[PDB]
């Protein structure tokens, strides 16, 4: 059966404006394993995104970690966007430093 990806977006270090950091997009609970993951800056694809190897959990569902270098500011928005056969529409989760 198809399983819909869950998406969590979080920073590696405490966010400080103007300071280099790393942004993580952890995508879980999906099947089949074919998936597209994009990380976005002000809606535009971030080119150099690094992906972990695809893996799966005890319950057989797949997971993967995307991450990229980023420097947060007051005004830039960051997001993680996922396309998968389980969803008619791509799913986007925005980074929120407050959350």
């Amino acid at each position: 059966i198809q399983k819909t990806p869950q998406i969590q977006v979080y920073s590696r270090h405490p966010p400080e404006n103007g300071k280099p950091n790393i942004l993580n997009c952890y995508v879980t609970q999906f099947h089949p394993p074919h998936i597209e993951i994009q990380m976005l800056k002000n809606g535009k694809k971030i080119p150099k995104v690094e992906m972990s190897d695809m893996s799966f959990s005890k319950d057989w569902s797949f997971y993967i970690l995307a991450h990229t270098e980023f420097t947060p500011t007051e005004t830039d928005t960051y997001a993680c966007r996922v396309k998968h056969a389980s969803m008619a529409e791509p799913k986007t989760v925005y980074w929120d430093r407050d959350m």
Binding site: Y10, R12, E50, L65
Partner: peptide
């Protein structure tokens, strides 16, 4: 929350 991986073989939790 759940344990979330960092890319440097460390963990994140909130």
């Amino acid at each position: 929350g759940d344990f979330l991986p960092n890319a440097d073989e460390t963990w994140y939790l909130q």
